[PDB]
């Protein structure tokens, strides 16, 4: 046969461009799973994949007219599609795929076979990812402190541990997690490690997603959530006052099945996985809209009992209510949060609690005993 | 005359090709019958049908501007339309089409009569669809529960059984059935099962995507008037809707009565159910109530009398 | 000259493809006069006929790129245009034309030169259209009890007649017959006979609207819009269910099976030629 | 030079192409201006003119791709247009134009410096156009009955008579007589589709606020702020029997009233 | 050496006859007019209109359309920056040149080029009905007389209406709304139809009236760009409000125009050589 | 070897006259300016401009149109990552070059290249009339003095009207909403035109349906908007809505009126006090005006810019 046949046979045998249910090929140039609408990149990996077929089948992809035909009887030999995204225990970064079951770290074409298309936005390196670090007792102390490692502080300490250890998996997680507290005891702390940990796959929303109906208007909120594996619900409003909704039941149900029901913009087709792990963040007493026996199986919770307290008004907070220990917040603390010094070695302690509560299976567990609305079905 | 005459006409003597009265051409490719508008993939089945020419015609569809001459003759050669999705008593299912009078499933070429563009998304297997499997006590006892076979619970159970059977024929069914009761009765379960076992045959709420969807889950005198006829976009659903009050209409008249049915739930795993334990159960459920109760013909006949 | 001339100009020469003033191109496939917006159908018209034409013709209107060249010639040698439905006592069955005036029916080439756009949408045949037939009866009986065929309903039978016998002719009528009476009387059973009747020449609204021959309705203003020749060619007879533009009349299951297509049909035809053979005229 | 240079320097000596201040090449074919936008219609312009060019000109105006080398070559010679429908005193027929000062007609080529792009949509012909025939006077004692020729009825008689006459001059007329159906269905018989809002409005002649409609800008309109009102007090009609006769009374009415200055006094 | 269709479009380009505007829309110079064409781009019409002054073997080629395309693709790839249209203020385009206003010499041909103008009044001009001596400037001198009088008592109104008319011919921006306050045929009409006969086509709702200079809210108004720019004199915060106070069928035959034209020029180059300005 | 025409897309692409952005267009370096169209790619300007570069051969080629889109689209083919835009914060991109606003130092040519700016002021610059004494400077800030008095009453005020000028250079994101409490005829009006006069294309005029409805796609990358819903409020703090450099002034002569005050809004308003326009559109004051807000930047952002918000003057809350 034609030269221009045999060459686009051997850039499929490779494996290099795939295509999906949505009607978009993907191709895989610079080590990453790459693709677009508005213009279809097939011709760029015609030419970068040059340095692997033989002598004459390289010195001929040179012309533009001779790559897209090459282009044409590529997309002619793809007949069926498939799926992406599939894995769920591996965390995507910039140059490859990090394992969890083990902590094995893939990169280039040994991670490829996981067709993953988001990914995390910085490299990584195995000189942070070291078990003992300075900044390793520099974050067991603020975990410790954040969390006394007391028997009282016991259950709440493993629940926020699996909190927020199911942050790294690629799947779907039935649980709206609360964060009861008080300001100044250590959220925005927590939500700033972990969008250093974990960076693109992370999305900070407001308190209209719980307040809302997901059915009609355009729906960013369930765009953007597009395999994002985080959610947080920070900056939640008071309930006590006047013209303040409640927490809508049939959202949550809406936020717990492994395909969230709900359309792109102006788009027609539903197909928007719901990876995330909404996190909540409080101050008050949480009160629903409507309560049923079926729906304290999709809520827990969990409490912060640590007040930081610079000396301005450190002297003011050791008699309040929920507090075992109030500690200091470091001056350039959170300057050093963005500077990105402890976030391997959060990703490391991350990853030891992925392998020590999610190897046999991943499953979050509601406790609506702590919470005290209901009070009348148990 | 010249080759890639007799290649397309070899090619249109296989029916493979067909065009629509929307004015789309459909392929026959990986036995399924796919059909797309931003790109007519005529070319894709050129290119794999190649194999069963003979050598000197396979030896040249190869070249793209040799593929797109067959496509135009091809297309030149096309005059009258076909009609699509003719059979209403057939569930396609994503490797053939299955028969529910008798039963048989066809997988490949003899599941190419019935041009079926929809279905149901997954696959099938025998070995699921057996009669005797231990979980038909395990499906029957929800069955059971959900709706008692007692004499005075006779007429609701029954209603009820052709109200989930009709939603597997294709047609059109003129009913806004109704599922009065109180919440946390198993409507819900329900809404479950009937989605796993029909799959991409149900929606979820809107008149694009109502196109030969065979059953919608959820008051206006009219839209009854509009959900009720062979052509609304066909219209192959079943509108089938759960009410938990006491439910009005807008305006009330004597020929619009025979349009609505109640059903009434008296009798107050998800994770179970969301593995699709029971979907290849609850289908064969489904078929037999369809074979026990709509062989020679389908209808749905509504109930004004319980209705106050 | 060249030969893909010839061809265009021998093509032409069977009157095969016509312009009409809305600017789009007609061309007869199949028994049928075609015309396609989004597409034109003229190279399909060029490969069905090379049948016709001399072997040295035939033998290469089988490039896809020599089927546009003489497309493109034709395109520029039809310079006048045409207009379409000018008979309006003509009747378009899926496969001929049908006369009012006798009855005889034109099947193929025959009707050809009535330039007929739409259709009912069926077929047709004489072996149902015989005058003797039990149907004839069976529907003879349901018009002697809907209308009876009495000395005090003498005007209100003959006036339903007319206005049935109106919606078969193509033209311009003026007249908004009324259907007045009581519910489960006839008229849904008349409605669902007549749909099956003349097809889809019938809708239950000035898009598809256009060209039709029957539009039923189960502002004066109105009733002045719609009674002129253009309102989109109008040719419907409005019912629903400016004194001279207003009429009235006083008053399942084998219905869709169309067992008194054809006899309705013959009734209509009927009362067609019985009413208006020497001028088609309503009388409010 | 080349020969596809040649035929469309011959083609533009014919005066066949104009261009238009509205930017749509107005081609000349059948003895009709005719003009498109959605198609541009020069090709059948030059297919059917080369029975006029010499045989070894005509003999390669028969591929379509040397008919829009030629048509690419004229459209870039035209590069001055041309203004439309100037003359106000001719009224064209679709075979021709008819003078109102003299009652002439011009058929074919003679009708043809006066580019006329509208027309009345009817052929006509000097049978019908006789001044002695019965329906000159089956039409002349309804036009009697209708406005009485007396003494009293007078003065209102000739307002009527130059209210009617002015709807066949193309010029701008700022007036809105105020009026039956008779002589409406007569207008419509004679003028034909000169005779019916802004877009099929356009060089119409007659139609059937007050400064928007009495301004230059086109507008040739004759509608049926106290110098701009005045006020004047079937089957065989649809047959076309006294088209032409009303024809010819109103160019009588025409080159009688309006033959040096046309004008319409409130 | 290269091929001549390089050569044609460089010695093309060094005539300046082809321009690109900020807009994206290339101008090109026919017929002693700057047209400008956005649905189809006339450059082909240039090319073909200009083989005249090429060598022969040059001109004896841009025949062929597929020729004449190759040269527009090398003229668009060989203009980079863009220039800026209608910048001198003092001139006149007429449809068949430039007139100036500071010493009254009309520029027709080639020689008005430099003056890159768009707009045009639409009307032609020739010098026999533009000399000082006539019937004509009697025949409006009178008019203007008694339309407004010659009086010590109707004198500042005399000149405020006098410095209102000449400004209609600056082609800059002009920060006034000057009234015409008086009763009803009185002049005012036929003012402005003397006007619209001496500017014709610069006389007129915000795309139309780019570039114009006469027509018949006050921040945006007195702004030098509104991209439309404005050079209108509008004709019906205190700092820009002033007001003056108070045959057509021969106007119609335009009878005066060049009289009023002549009028006009000496009008303006008597009130508005040093710098012109509107006081309110 | 090769084909020639590979040979010519590489050597073109070795020089980096051309960058593929985040946004899907290329932009391309001609006459000491980056710019970039998207009804047509002008690559082949480029090519066709640079050909004075390479050698003999491959010079004597790039005039056919048709072997001008071989490299064009060769050069696309090659363009596989994209290339951020307008990194540097304190640069001012002038028509023919860029400004540092660290030192002063002016880069003019291709020296002004690695600072990839796409937006500019849209005039010239030169540094005659950048001369810290002449009559100008003088002219001008007399003005300044008159219009803020150097007074140790009106200090606060005088250096935070300052400050909020000196950021008008800035290319960052500044969340702030300063006010501009005072009434007309004061010198607001001069304060506007002085500085649309000398930062030209990067200002802006909105009006004040932004502030009171739920006018963006050109407002990217402007570094100066002009002109109460809560929640435009954190829509015009965010670094991104089009990448948003601008810092927002509203116009106001009344008392101002907040939707719904929280305690979270307090922290992003600020307010300043006020207690020859033919000249200015002479563009006379313009280099002067330049070199004192340039000034005010080198004395009052050396290290890092931030606005602080002072919710104390402003008596609205008046009770948090």
């Not at 140039?29 to 994949?49: G, H, Q």
């Not at 300001?183 to 929303?205: C, M, N, P, Q, Y």
Request: charged letters at 30%.
């Amino acid at each position: 046969g034609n030269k221009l046949f045999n060459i686009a046979q051997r850039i499929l045998d490779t494996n290099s461009v795939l295509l999906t249910e949505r009607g978009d090929h993907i191709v895989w140039i610079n080590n990453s799973w790459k693709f677009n609408s508005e213009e279809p990149l097939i011709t760029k990996l015609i030419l970068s994949i040059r340095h692997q077929l033989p002598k004459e089948y390289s010195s001929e992809l040179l012309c533009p007219r001779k790559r897209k035909t090459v282009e044409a009887n590529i997309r002619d030999m793809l007949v069926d599609s498939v799926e992406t995204d599939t894995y769920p225990d591996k965390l995507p970064f910039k140059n490859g795929v990090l394992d969890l079951v083990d902590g094995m770290f893939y990169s280039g074409d040994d991670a490829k076979k996981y067709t993953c298309t988001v990914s995390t936005g910085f490299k990584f390196d195995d000189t942070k990812f070291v078990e003992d670090s300075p900044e390793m007792e520099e974050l067991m102390n603020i975990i410790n402190d954040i969390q006394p490692l007391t028997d009282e502080n016991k259950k709440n300490r493993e629940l926020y541990e699996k909190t927020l250890s199911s942050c790294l998996c690629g799947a779907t997680k039935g649980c709206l997690t609360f964060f009861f507290g008080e300001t100044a005891t250590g959220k925005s702390t927590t939500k700033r490690l972990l969008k250093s940990a974990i960076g693109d796959l992370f999305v900070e929303t407001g308190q209209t997603i719980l307040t809302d109906v997901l059915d009609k208007g355009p729906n960013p909120f369930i765009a953007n959530m597009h395999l994002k594996r985080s959610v947080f619900c920070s900056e939640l409003p008071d309930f006590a006052c006047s013209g303040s909704k409640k927490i809508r039941s049939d959202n949550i149900k809406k936020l717990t099945e492994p395909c969230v029901i709900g359309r792109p913009c102006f788009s027609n087709k539903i197909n928007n996985r719901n990876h995330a792990t909404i996190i909540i963040d409080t101050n008050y007493k949480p009160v629903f809209d409507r309560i049923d026996n079926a729906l304290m199986r999709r809520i827990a919770v969990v409490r912060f009992r640590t007040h930081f307290s610079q000396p301005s008004g450190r002297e003011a907070a050791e008699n309040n209510d929920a507090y075992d220990k109030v500690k200091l917040l470091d001056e350039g603390l959170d300057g050093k949060i963005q500077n990105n010094r402890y976030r391997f070695a959060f990703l490391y302690l991350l990853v030891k609690w992925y392998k020590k509560y999610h190897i046999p299976i991943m499953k979050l567990y509601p406790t609506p005993e702590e919470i005290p609305d209901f009070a009348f079905y148990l």
